[PDB]
């Protein structure tokens, strides 16, 4: 009666996620226990574009495939100088498994660096060409920045006119002239572009000793700096007080 | 998720195009110091990390080599990166270059980029010094040779003569011919490294 | 360095009777005091199962060789399930004599007592709380040293030992707050938070305080010939069912 | 070299050997054998601690100690003579040329060693000073020549880049005619530009088309 | 190297038949609820119904596979050969267990009679 009712009552009463390339950062950081790069592709692209290669506009234009290769036409716009940037357009040929490069060629160069990057772009090593173009843009931007700063801090007392393209700035006072060379030499026959700073004084009559001015420039740039090293050279070539 | 797969495909191929440059930054987080705030239930990184991905492109095999990684971690009391881990062999003073850049303290990302550029120039230097002698032994101007790890001390063979070189950064600084007329043939090769390929056909004509 | 071995007792016994038969069987004169001790004497206990009847029992011999001088400290409670236990130092034969007498006379069953890990933690916790005559409990400090010895594959990890100095122990105890349990609320959560090693689950071997005691899994080495009331209270409390 | 053995051998073979037999019995050539044996027995009797095998060992050790004390003075006086350019002052390659068989020529280490050797039989001193001056002038001319050669190499590299670019772009192999008629092409281009400027002056007569033409011409002549 | 997929399909088949039984009982409860907007015998009848469904699926698999040397065939044949090699041993063990329990009953009854006799005798002996 009661025990059968209790037995009848006892009888009748009887995470893992998969992350991807496009995913939010919170769900990525919840399931983070390995020491691997983050798979959020937009954040990785933000690190690859905003932080390591700023002022550069890379955009993939087209990509095809034959039978087992992959062609890829991409263009770069080195926009560090906002007035007139120099562009380029590549075309690469993969091998897509045991992946090598077969061919790479240039479809166009914007005609501002075409001869300056003529000896460079015949080494057939496209990584060195890309890095040399980016560093040449950076060094050219630093050159025009330093020369505009030296003009802005000297435009009142002197006359400040440039020369050949921008490679040598000339100041003159009272007379006495001073020319500050700054040459960027692309590589050809290291692989990054290198700079060369040299000066030459004129005391009205003739040139000075190039060895002594070279030693003065070397010491006064090795000691002070570059942006604040040339200002000391203009202060010495003034010599009204010290 | 089909057009999103296409957008991810364009993001991946753009990441590869950016990785062709050689020196890349990639995000990273140590999972020891992933803390929770408990006032909102969200996760914030305690110490930020920055990873560099050095990747030298070869030319004899025309494919990219094994990538090298430098991982920087942000210090907890100074707001300046210090070199946490690096997968670089020990003939490159990677800690010394990191102490040399900017006096020792690295704050902004371009200050880390200069350090990554110096280490990448040393890696390309080692790669080119190996590639030149491998392309030499491919054309059999030299016989069976041996190299060091950084390819800075080689000893190849000539038709009879053994030649030993201690080569610095793309230039030969020491020559050793052993088997008065030897010294002319010793300061013959004591020049650059492409002229070594030029000068070794100047005697076997 | 008087190592103590511990044995449980089945029946609550009083040694006021039959002790003359021990004096007949051994032909010596031993001393017994019949105390009534109360662990923590702060008034937030209400005296609810808080009394203990302790029978310290020495043997009045010469104290030249310490191996023959063996105390027999007892404890008991009329409310616990396993009521009593005895614990003795010394390396004499009279220990087995009095164990044989207490087995045959009273009809009890004795098993050796093996300690767990949290019992060793509570025994190191209650072997530093010092008692004074001003009805308050103060805490001294010793530079402790835990000791582990796990059983791994191929004897990969043989033995390892966390070691904590005195000043860092005091700093952790003040960092947790005012408590009478440093090693279970200050040190072990700190070790788990900064290392990840759960100490209650890891195999302990010998929680060592510097100079004062040395606990083990079956025994306790000490420096004096006596044990504190909190140590015996924790041992009697731990072996229940 | 091996002076203790020589001292002890000289003692044992030319003092005791001469004072043992012939200094005891050979004096009887002027003489009886009995009184000679009596005096020989007295001599060997009242001497038996001097010519022992241990006392002369101690004597030879004392002779060695005196000769070592005399050797230490000439040892300290042979290092403090006239210097004449000792070791640890020249570089590696200088003393390697001194010891012969250099087996590895290296011009940079030779420069860094030649620029390190110090200055000062007076004709040998003047000859060494003149040779040091000539070697320093060789190193100076080597550095100047290397820097000038690098500048010349970059200069002719840019020259070869210009000649390759004009051989490619003109596609006629007429570089001399190109450089000769550059001025003629430039003046006919300026004549065409003057005709275009006259047409721009007398074609539109606007104020905004002139602005667009001026902006295009300025951003084409400047960029 | 197929053993990994073998135990993987074993565990996945166990989860499969667990969720199949769950699907059957939940569809039955769904029909009970949605038929109109609960006892012991009714629950047992649904359990018998699901047993007969699984029984018919078993015999359908058997007649589809048996009525040679194909894929995943010899596994079922060797399993059906190996599953029924212990029934005689099970029945012999159960029979030996019953005989041992009967002998223990006889020994305990003899010991209880003897102990009662010794208690009465040693109580009279005092």
């Amino acid at each position: 009666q009661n025990d059968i009712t209790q037995d009848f009552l006892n009888l009748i009463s009887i995470r893992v996620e998969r992350i991807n390339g496009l995913t939010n950062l919170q769900k990525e950081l919840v399931t983070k226990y390995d020491t691997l790069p983050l798979l959020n592709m937009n954040l990785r692209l933000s690190y690859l574009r905003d932080h390591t290669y700023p002022h550069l506009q890379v955009s993939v234009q087209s990509r095809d495939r034959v039978h087992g290769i992959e062609v890829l036409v991409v263009n770069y716009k080195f926009c560090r100088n906002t007035m007139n940037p120099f562009e380029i357009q590549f075309k690469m040929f993969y091998k897509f498994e045991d992946s090598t490069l077969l061919k790479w060629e240039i479809l166009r160069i914007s005609t501002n660096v075409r001869l300056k990057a003529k000896q460079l772009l015949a080494t057939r090593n496209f990584q060195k060409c890309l890095l040399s173009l980016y560093e040449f843009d950076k060094i050219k931007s630093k050159k025009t920045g330093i020369f505009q700063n030296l003009i802005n801090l000297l435009k009142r007392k002197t006359r400040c006119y440039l020369m050949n393209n921008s490679d040598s700035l000339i100041v003159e006072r009272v007379t006495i002239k001073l020319q500050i060379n700054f040459i960027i030499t692309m590589p050809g026959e290291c692989f990054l572009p290198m700079s060369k700073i040299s000066i030459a004084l004129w005391k009205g009559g003739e040139r000075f000793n190039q060895i002594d001015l070279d030693e003065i420039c070397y010491g006064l740039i090795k000691e002070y700096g570059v942006k604040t090293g040339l200002k000391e050279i203009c202060n010495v070539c003034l010599f009204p007080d010290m | 998720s089909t057009s999103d797969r296409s957008e991810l495909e364009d993001y991946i191929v753009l990441e590869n195009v950016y990785r062709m440059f050689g020196i890349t930054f990639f995000p990273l987080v140590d999972p020891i110091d992933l803390k929770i705030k408990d006032a909102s239930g969200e996760i914030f990184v305690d110490r930020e990390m920055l990873g560099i991905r050095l990747e030298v492109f070869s030319e004899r095999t025309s494919q990219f080599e094994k990538p090298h990684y430098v991982l920087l971690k942000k210090r907890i009391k100074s707001n300046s990166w210090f070199l946490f881990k690096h997968t670089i062999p020990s003939f490159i003073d990677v800690q010394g270059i990191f102490d040399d850049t900017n006096g020792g303290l690295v704050i902004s990302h371009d200050d880390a980029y200069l350090f990554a550029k110096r280490v990448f120039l040393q890696l390309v230097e080692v790669q080119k010094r190996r590639q030149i002698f491998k392309d030499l032994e491919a054309k059999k101007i030299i016989h069976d040779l041996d190299l060091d790890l950084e390819s800075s001390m080689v000893s190849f063979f000539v038709k009879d003569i053994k030649v030993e070189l201690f080569v610095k950064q793309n230039e030969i600084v020491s020559c050793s011919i052993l088997d008065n007329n030897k010294s002319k043939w010793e300061i013959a090769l004591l020049g650059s490294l492409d002229d070594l390929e030029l000068k070794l056909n100047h005697s076997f004509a | 360095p008087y190592t103590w071995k511990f044995l449980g007792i089945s029946k609550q016994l009083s040694l006021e009777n039959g002790i003359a038969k021990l004096n007949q069987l051994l032909n010596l004169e031993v001393d017994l005091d019949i105390q009534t001790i109360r662990v923590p004497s702060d008034p937030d206990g209400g005296t609810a199962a808080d009394e203990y009847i302790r029978y310290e029992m020495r043997l009045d011999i010469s104290n030249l060789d310490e191996g023959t001088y063996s105390k027999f400290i007892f404890l008991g409670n009329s409310k616990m399930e396993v009521p009593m236990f005895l614990c003795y130092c010394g390396t004499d034969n009279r220990n087995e004599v009095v164990l044989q007498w207490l087995k045959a006379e009273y009809g009890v069953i004795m098993w050796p007592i093996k300690f767990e890990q949290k019992t060793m933690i509570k025994l190191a916790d209650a072997s530093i709380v010092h008692v004074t005559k001003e009805n308050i409990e103060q805490i001294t400090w010793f530079s402790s040293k835990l000791y582990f010895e796990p059983e791994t594959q191929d004897k990969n990890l043989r033995q390892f030992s966390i070691e904590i100095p005195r000043e860092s122990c005091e700093g952790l105890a003040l960092g947790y707050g005012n408590t009478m349990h440093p090693y279970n609320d200050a040190i072990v959560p700190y070790i788990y938070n900064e290392t990840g090693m759960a100490v209650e689950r890891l195999p302990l071997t010998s929680v060592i305080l510097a100079g004062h005691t040395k606990i083990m899994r079956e025994s306790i080495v000490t420096s004096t010939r006596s044990l504190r009331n909190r140590v015996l209270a924790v041992v009697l409390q731990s072996i229940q069912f | 070299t091996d002076t203790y053995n020589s001292i002890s051998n000289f003692i044992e073979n030319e003092l005791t050997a001469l004072l043992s037999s012939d200094d005891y019995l050979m004096d009887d050539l002027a003489g009886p054998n009995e009184v000679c044996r009596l005096l020989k027995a007295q001599v060997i009797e009242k001497r038996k601690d001097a010519m022992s095998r241990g006392k002369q060992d101690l004597l030879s050790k004392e002779i060695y100690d005196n000769e070592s004390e005399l050797r230490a003075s000439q040892s300290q006086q042979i290092m403090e003579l006239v210097g004449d350019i000792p070791k640890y002052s020249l570089g590696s390659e200088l003393r390697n040329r001194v010891e012969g068989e250099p087996q590895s020529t290296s011009i940079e280490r030779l420069i860094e060693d030649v620029l390190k050797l110090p200055q000062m039989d007076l004709k040998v001193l003047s000859e060494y000073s003149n040779l040091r001056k000539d070697l320093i002038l060789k190193c100076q001319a080597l550095q100047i020549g290397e820097s000038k050669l690098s500048d010349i190499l970059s200069q002719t590299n840019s020259i070869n880049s210009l000649t390759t670019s004009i051989k490619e772009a003109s596609e006629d192999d007429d570089i001399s005619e190109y450089f000769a008629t550059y001025n003629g092409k430039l003046v006919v281009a300026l004549e065409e530009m003057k005709l275009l400027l006259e047409e721009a002056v007398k074609t539109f007569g606007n104020s905004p088309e002139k602005r667009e033409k001026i902006k295009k011409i300025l951003s084409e002549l400047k960029k | 190297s197929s053993e990994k997929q073998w135990e993987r399909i074993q565990q996945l088949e166990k989860e499969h038949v667990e969720v199949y039984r769950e699907l059957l009982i939940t569809l039955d409860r769904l029909y009970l609820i949605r038929r109109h907007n609960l006892s012991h015998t009714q629950q047992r009848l649904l359990e018998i119904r699901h047993q007969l469904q699984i029984n018919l699926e078993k015999t359908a698999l058997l007649i589809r596979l048996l009525e040679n040397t194909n894929v995943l065939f010899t596994k079922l044949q060797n399993l059906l050969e190996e599953s029924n090699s212990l029934d005689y041993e099970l029945l012999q063990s159960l029979g030996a267990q019953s005989s041992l329990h009967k002998q223990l009953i006889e020994s305990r009854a003899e010991r209880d009679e003897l102990m009662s006799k010794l208690i009465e005798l040693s109580s009279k002996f005092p």
Binding site: S99 | - | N156, T195, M197 | - | -
Partner: protein, 371 residues
């Protein structure tokens, strides 16, 4: 007073026999050929009793009695070659101890030595003090140049314990055998005097606890990718996760994804079956203590490790001193984490196995090794 190769020392015959019984037969045959080509004693005719003996498959005792009782001690060079071939054969018996080679300002100095001209200069520097013999060979597998310096004394010429110094090819770190006598200091100082030739080099030691094999001490501190990562960062030292940039983009980690387990951030470990979660938890312990995939033995076994964790809570310095031991520490910690005894979500980096075989203070969350 430097010893030439044809010198014969006074070595016991039974211990040379016991050394020679630990070698196979083909290396004994090559040693026989090389020794009789070099020195000889008791050309093509005497090779005939060996070319047919090993082709018959005779025991080693006959050939070691032949090679020991026609040179009836063999010499100093043959004993050096025997002990060096024993080093190549069984590498787990020796014990190495590293030492970096700084210079000048403090920057490390790559050695870059030649095995020919190093031997005469070192033997001439050591020859002014003791009777020494220096033998150098290149290891057949690893890129090291193991030297063997054996110093003699006189009461013929008795022999001391040999002292091995292993140079890698392009590292500032030089491994040497563990000894604290005065001859070990003399040999290490003479090596640091003769390796320089341009500017002075000092050997400041980098570690105090010796490492067992030479493949282990070559992985840990030689020129390799595992020299710094070594722990949970071992995916960066072998490059498991990223391919070449010219590789296929249909098979990318960002496009195929990976299977991960959601971490618990509430402390629910002290309050305690779905074998997919068991597989992922075992993989999680494997990832935390290793790369991404026996089964507990790490890439390098480490004998002894002792840390010192100096945290700081409300301006109090709270030091604890962990001190491990065993045959392989971090594999044992991997096993303890595998039995659910150590919470893997709170295992720090330095306990998981990074900067391995080092031991030192941990201030502010940053490891700094002991001096």
């Amino acid at each position: 007073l430097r010893l030439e190769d044809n010198y014969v020392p006074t070595s016991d015959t039974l211990v040379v026999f016991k050394q020679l019984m630990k070698l196979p037969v083909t290396v004994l045959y090559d040693l026989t050929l090389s020794w009789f080509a070099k020195f000889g004693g008791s050309i093509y005719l005497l090779t005939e009793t060996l070319d047919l003996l090993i082709e018959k498959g005779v025991r080693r005792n006959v050939i070691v009695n032949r090679i020991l009782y026609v040179y009836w001690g063999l010499n100093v060079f043959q004993l050096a070659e025997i002990d060096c071939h024993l080093m190549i054969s069984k590498p787990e018996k020796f014990k190495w101890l590293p030492s970096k080679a700084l210079r000048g300002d403090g920057k490390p100095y790559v050695v870059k030595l030649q095995p020919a001209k190093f031997i005469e200069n070192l033997q001439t520097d050591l020859a002014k003090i003791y009777h020494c013999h220096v033998y150098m060979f290149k290891h057949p597998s690893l890129p090291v140049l193991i030297t063997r310096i054996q110093l003699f004394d006189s009461n013929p010429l008795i022999s001391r314990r040999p002292y091995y110094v292993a140079f890698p090819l392009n590292s500032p770190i030089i491994f040497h055998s563990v000894d604290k006598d005065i001859y070990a200091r003399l040999v290490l100082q003479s090596i640091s005097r003769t390796i320089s030739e341009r500017e002075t080099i000092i050997f400041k030691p980098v570690q105090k606890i010796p490492v067992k094999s030479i493949h282990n001490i070559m992985t840990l501190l030689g020129p390799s990718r595992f020299a710094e990562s070594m722990g949970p960062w071992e995916c960066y030292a072998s490059a498991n996760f990223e391919r070449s940039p010219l590789h296929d983009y249909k098979k990318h980690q960002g496009l195929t994804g990976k299977k991960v387990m959601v971490r618990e951030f509430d402390d629910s470990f002290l309050n305690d079956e779905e074998p997919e979660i068991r597989r992922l938890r075992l993989e999680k312990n494997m990832i935390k203590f290793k790369g991404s995939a026996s089964r507990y033995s790490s890439l390098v076994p480490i004998e002894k490790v002792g840390f010192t964790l100096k945290n700081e809570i409300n301006s109090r310095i709270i030091t604890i001193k962990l001190k491990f031991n065993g045959n392989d520490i971090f594999g044992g910690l991997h096993e303890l984490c595998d039995k659910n005894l150590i919470n893997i979500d709170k295992v720090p980096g330095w306990l998981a196995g990074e900067n391995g075989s080092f031991s030192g203070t941990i201030m502010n969350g940053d490891f700094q090794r002991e001096q």
